[PDB]
Amino acid sequence: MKRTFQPSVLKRNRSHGFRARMATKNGRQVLARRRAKGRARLTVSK
Amino acid sequence: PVYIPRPRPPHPRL
Amino acid sequence: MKAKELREKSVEELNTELLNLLREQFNLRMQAASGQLQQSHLLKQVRRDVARVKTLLNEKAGA
Amino acid sequence: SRVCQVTGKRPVTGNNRSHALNATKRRFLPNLHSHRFWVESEKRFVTLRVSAKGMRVIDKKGIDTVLAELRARGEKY
Amino acid sequence: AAKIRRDDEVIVLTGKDKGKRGKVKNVLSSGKVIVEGINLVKKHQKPVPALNQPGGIVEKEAAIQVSNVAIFNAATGKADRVGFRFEDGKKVRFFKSNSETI
Amino acid sequence: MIREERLLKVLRAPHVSEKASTAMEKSNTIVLKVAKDATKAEIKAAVQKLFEVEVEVVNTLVVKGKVKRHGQRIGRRSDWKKAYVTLKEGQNL
RNA sequence: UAAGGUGAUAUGAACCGUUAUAACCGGCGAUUUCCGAAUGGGGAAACCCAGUGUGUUUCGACACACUAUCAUUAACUGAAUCCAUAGGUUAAUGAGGCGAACCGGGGGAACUGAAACAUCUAAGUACCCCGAGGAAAAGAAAUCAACCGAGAUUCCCCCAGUAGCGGCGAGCGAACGGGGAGCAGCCCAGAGCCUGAAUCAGUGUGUGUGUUAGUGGAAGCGUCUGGAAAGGCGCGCGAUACAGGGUGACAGCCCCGUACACAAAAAUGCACAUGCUGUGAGCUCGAUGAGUAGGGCGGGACACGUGGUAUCCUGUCUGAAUAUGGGGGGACCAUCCUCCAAGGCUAAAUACUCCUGACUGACCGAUAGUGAACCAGUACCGUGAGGGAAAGGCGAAAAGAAC
RNA sequence: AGGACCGAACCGACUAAUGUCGAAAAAUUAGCGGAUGACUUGUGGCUGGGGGUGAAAGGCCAAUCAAACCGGGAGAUAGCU
RNA sequence: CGAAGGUGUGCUGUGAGGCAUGCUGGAGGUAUCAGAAGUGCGAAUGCUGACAUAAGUAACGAUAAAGCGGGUGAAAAGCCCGCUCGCCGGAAGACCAAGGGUUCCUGUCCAACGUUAAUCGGGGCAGGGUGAGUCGACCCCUAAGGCGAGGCCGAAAGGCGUAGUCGAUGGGAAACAGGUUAAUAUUCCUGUACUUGGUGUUACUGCGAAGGGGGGACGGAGAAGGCUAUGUUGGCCGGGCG
RNA sequence: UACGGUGCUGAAGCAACAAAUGCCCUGCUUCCAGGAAAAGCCUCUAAGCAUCAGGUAACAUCAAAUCGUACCCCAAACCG
Ligand SMILES: [Mg+2]
Ligand SMILES: [Mg+2]
Ligand SMILES: [Mg+2]
Ligand SMILES: [Mg+2]
Ligand SMILES: [Mg+2]
Ligand SMILES: [Mg+2]
Ligand SMILES: [Mg+2]
Ligand SMILES: [Mg+2]
Ligand SMILES: [Mg+2]
Ligand SMILES: [Mg+2]
Ligand SMILES: [Mg+2]
Ligand SMILES: [Mg+2]
Ligand SMILES: [Mg+2]
Ligand SMILES: [Mg+2]
Ligand SMILES: [Mg+2]
Ligand SMILES: [Mg+2]
Ligand SMILES: [Mg+2]
Ligand SMILES: [Mg+2]
Ligand SMILES: [Mg+2]
Ligand SMILES: [Mg+2]
Ligand SMILES: [Mg+2]
Ligand SMILES: [Mg+2]
Ligand SMILES: [Mg+2]
Ligand SMILES: [Mg+2]
Ligand SMILES: [Mg+2]
Ligand SMILES: [Mg+2]
Ligand SMILES: [Mg+2]
Ligand SMILES: [Mg+2]
Ligand SMILES: [Mg+2]
Ligand SMILES: [Mg+2]
Ligand SMILES: [Mg+2]
Ligand SMILES: [Mg+2]
Ligand SMILES: [Mg+2]
Ligand SMILES: [Mg+2]
Ligand SMILES: [Mg+2]
Ligand SMILES: [Mg+2]
Ligand SMILES: [Mg+2]
Ligand SMILES: [Mg+2]
Ligand SMILES: [Mg+2]
Ligand SMILES: [Mg+2]
Ligand SMILES: [Mg+2]
Ligand SMILES: [Mg+2]
Ligand SMILES: [Mg+2]
Ligand SMILES: [Mg+2]
Ligand SMILES: [Mg+2]
Ligand SMILES: [Mg+2]
Ligand SMILES: [Mg+2]
Ligand SMILES: [Mg+2]
Ligand SMILES: [Mg+2]
Ligand SMILES: [Mg+2]
Ligand SMILES: [Mg+2]
Ligand SMILES: [Mg+2]
Ligand SMILES: [Mg+2]
Ligand SMILES: [Mg+2]
Ligand SMILES: [Mg+2]
Ligand SMILES: [Mg+2]
Ligand SMILES: [Mg+2]
Ligand SMILES: [Mg+2]
Ligand SMILES: [Mg+2]
Ligand SMILES: [Mg+2]
Ligand SMILES: [Mg+2]
Ligand SMILES: [Mg+2]
Ligand SMILES: [Mg+2]
Ligand SMILES: [Mg+2]
Ligand SMILES: [Mg+2]
Ligand SMILES: [Mg+2]
Ligand SMILES: [Mg+2]
Ligand SMILES: [Mg+2]
Ligand SMILES: [Mg+2]
Ligand SMILES: [Mg+2]
Ligand SMILES: [Mg+2]
Ligand SMILES: [Mg+2]
Ligand SMILES: [Mg+2]
Ligand SMILES: [Mg+2]
Ligand SMILES: [Mg+2]
Ligand SMILES: [Mg+2]
Ligand SMILES: [Mg+2]
Ligand SMILES: [Mg+2]
After folding, report:
1. For labeling, which of A40, C28, F2, F16 is most exposed (least CB within 10 Å)?
2. Residue E81: which domain range?
3. CA-to-CA distance for D7 and D4, rounded, in angstroms?
4. How far is the CA of A42 from the centre of ligand 27 (A)?
5. CATH classification at residue A28
6. Residue with CA nearest C1' of nucleotide J67
7. Do D25 and D15 form a contact (C-beta atoms < 8 A)?
8. Contacting residues of C for F12, CB less than 8 Å apart
């Protein structure tokens, strides 16, 4: 049984990383929402 | 929980 | 070593000491690492002294 | 965009109204064309994307007046 | 400033030691003072083997609220309140009730 | 030429352990906890200046801090750099 | 300002200080790694790789500075192509990104209601996007009124759920006029009569008033119970202070405070007189906003769904008069009245609270009140967007239990 | 030579039994099919919601699919329980 | 000289209730008359926490398998040592990438975790441990693709895209054997190498690029030959003669 | 002896045969479905400099930074 989560750090950062978020107007609104909510981890960047 | 399995199908009273 | 008797000094003797304050700092750090520094306060003291001398350098550097 | 360089006419929005009065969002676009105007003062051709009303405005005024207005607005032509 | 200082003779106003008299040993920022031989607690101290292990039931002073002590006049022989005034430009404490400087 | 104010920051401590003892014993290598920046050239210059010994080569590694659970909180110790400084021939001073 | 102090869990260690560079508090400075608009290029954020210049150099290395893009301005340069322009380089100035609501604008649902549903409603709402400010917007009649008059805009209470609009259904819903809050008017389209002529805008001085640390600040003892007194009992005192909080039980007089009276080296807000800087004063005469008003077609906004539909805005096609002229007065015409579009600026009353302080509550009190009284937007869940807890109380004192 | 043959790896999933609060939210055991190809597989990339992709089953699109998920409109509405 | 609360008792009212009081509790409560309501719970397959029931029941997760002696220990079926036995051996061995992130090694501890015990552990606590010119990344180069100065287009947001710049899963320099730690080793050590640059000295001379050309540089299948890894046997050497 | 291991010494260390799916081989043969790119690399010159610079070749010297490296990795350490 292959499951849905097949981790890959490169794909993770290219898909949801900080620079991926900053690339688009909508990704920068994700960061604004998570900053407003007070999220300790802003992105998947560690 | 977070996952509730679908109940088994009833006997087809058809 | 206060700020009065360091502001009376000059940019060169004051660059001398802060170099030798650093030296002192490195010796105290190695001594504390080996476990021979039974005076923990000397680290904070020489650190604040280095900060003081660098402050006075930034003042004497023009403004 | 579909904006007249002379008059500033741009697409507006309104309704398509059917006979049953069904309203549908629609756009009214300006009658835009790219046209080379002969600037005699500059002895050259300047291409502007203008509506037909903009062409009428350039006929009424001069192309020099309209180009001065564009420059005042800061629009590059 | 503070009305009760370190090397200051005080009398206890409240508690088991009411009326007892001693001198302050140190002032705690929590608003409590340690007075010599006043608030004696019996502490069951574990025999720490590292430095020295007398262990035993030691008799320590416990902090007492500064509210609960007043400085002793020794001229009127009773508890007295403290005001502040300026003599020679310097702020000094004086007693109320025979307003002499401390 | 690395400046002495930088050399006096490069070195942090000597690293005391069984492997460090064995290294100084039978390979003439002193083990140091150095700064994090701490290039090999900076470490060599600093050892040769401050310990006034003759350095052959510097091997460096970064030690990643351990995740420790102090009380009921998850903490992590800082990463630090370790330098194996091989002295040339004579001896430590 | 000070006799204590070296932030907390959190004790120790090593020390600092006690009469004025211990600490603490405030002003002004300094320092301020890396990432991030991130801006030298790149990048899987907190990393990788540079170029140029200056300086140092134990000679091979080091330090610092600069190097993004766009807009505007300027200088130089510069093609096809003669000039020229495009383009290029450099320099200066500005912007960029973030932020809770309020504001203006560009777009813009559907659920739902209509007991179905399509016109209609929801609703110009949610939401997306752009932009600004401390408020914004609007704003000095081509406005109303009704032969009487009012006199910019905005906001509140009426008018009035009225007149109307409306598958005349569900629903939507004014204005006129009145009472208030607050009021403020100007400028260009222009030439001559004066040449910092009132203002206005930025600077420097002062004065006053705050603000950012602070200072002083009254007056209670005895006895009973009690572990402890602030409680009871008795006798006193202060009060421009009996707000509040703490202290071993409930304290005006134990403490911190409170009323009250003072305080600022420095920075700073406001108010006022100013000293410079710049435009501009007032008078005469003139001018007085054209692809515009209006029209046709299609839409939208007006309470008003095209209706008999005025008015406004426009995508499209047209197109005046120009003050012996034109707009409006709810189809339209005549008369009369009233105003002067096609150029702009403008405070106040009005909106909101990310945030600061003080105060308040017939608000909650740990399943409540914020999700979060507690190391909570955490643990944990999810690829991600995102979702999202539980968990307070020993005692007065740790005296937290030697043996 | 060959979408040739038999048959491991590998990729599948025809039958049966077990399991069905499982060892497992799809398996195990015994057999079974393809196994040089229209094959299989690693890494990276692209296509997105009335959209994608589909040797087509309305299949698949993160254990979710006749319109994914998250947040919002939103306390939709509910003559029903 | 004992509040609220809790827990009994007695009395009392038509009822919701009330009153008194013992014990607990240890600091609050509140008449009366008015006033306001988050004002009364058994149900909503209600929500949260706690605790039952089934029940000391099913199960303890591959039917590869254990036995014994000694040790340690409070305690040994499970740990350590030993001797047997059994199981895998195209793996159930070894080395990596991905992913994880200290699980590695040592000492110590056994509460919780481990489907039992545990002295043991990938568990707790503390300490140690990762050494590179040559391995990899970084770096140079590019693919798919991404971004993209200007540009073109688009109500806005933005879309596409040129120059360019990124982007490996591909191309591009170089290290081997032996030894060594409790834990690293092509990194440490020993021995023996190699590569690419910089700077000098010397000698001889045309060098010079965002440009040209070559090269890099490439499919499937098949067959054979030559080899080697590797194995077998013999020889040799050491040991044995059961 | 910590009886876990530590230290010292150390013979022979050859041949034949067999043999890969590994290497020669990015070869060869054949087929059609006709099988990356760019750089490093070699070479050629342009402008430009030709004494210089630069290139080539010896020898010498210097440098080669930084980051990863433990451990699991058909697994009790990854996804379930
Ligand atoms: Mg992806
Ligand atoms: Mg080495
Ligand atoms: Mg390394
Ligand atoms: Mg950048
Ligand atoms: Mg810069
Ligand atoms: Mg940068
Ligand atoms: Mg780069
Ligand atoms: Mg901005
Ligand atoms: Mg509808
Ligand atoms: Mg309906
Ligand atoms: Mg209905
Ligand atoms: Mg502002
Ligand atoms: Mg305004
Ligand atoms: Mg009149
Ligand atoms: Mg009808
Ligand atoms: Mg005071
Ligand atoms: Mg007082
Ligand atoms: Mg009490
Ligand atoms: Mg005019
Ligand atoms: Mg019109
Ligand atoms: Mg009309
Ligand atoms: Mg018209
Ligand atoms: Mg009109
Ligand atoms: Mg009219
Ligand atoms: Mg006019
Ligand atoms: Mg206007
Ligand atoms: Mg709560
Ligand atoms: Mg409670
Ligand atoms: Mg076949
Ligand atoms: Mg198979
Ligand atoms: Mg299938
Ligand atoms: Mg089957
Ligand atoms: Mg077959
Ligand atoms: Mg077969
Ligand atoms: Mg893939
Ligand atoms: Mg079907
Ligand atoms: Mg699925
Ligand atoms: Mg649908
Ligand atoms: Mg939803
Ligand atoms: Mg709604
Ligand atoms: Mg509902
Ligand atoms: Mg109460
Ligand atoms: Mg009892
Ligand atoms: Mg209720
Ligand atoms: Mg009921
Ligand atoms: Mg219930
Ligand atoms: Mg149960
Ligand atoms: Mg039971
Ligand atoms: Mg049973
Ligand atoms: Mg049974
Ligand atoms: Mg059983
Ligand atoms: Mg079993
Ligand atoms: Mg088992
Ligand atoms: Mg045994
Ligand atoms: Mg067993
Ligand atoms: Mg651990
Ligand atoms: Mg282990
Ligand atoms: Mg262990
Ligand atoms: Mg036990
Ligand atoms: Mg157990
Ligand atoms: Mg462990
Ligand atoms: Mg490409
Ligand atoms: Mg693009
Ligand atoms: Mg652009
Ligand atoms: Mg590249
Ligand atoms: Mg690669
Ligand atoms: Mg890369
Ligand atoms: Mg190992
Ligand atoms: Mg050329
Ligand atoms: Mg061989
Ligand atoms: Mg061999
Ligand atoms: Mg043999
Ligand atoms: Mg023999
Ligand atoms: Mg094969
Ligand atoms: Mg030369
Ligand atoms: Mg040579
Ligand atoms: Mg390893
Ligand atoms: Mg291992």
Report:
1. A40
2. 1-102
3. 6
4. 26
5. 1.10.287.3980
6. F62
7. yes
8. 29, 33
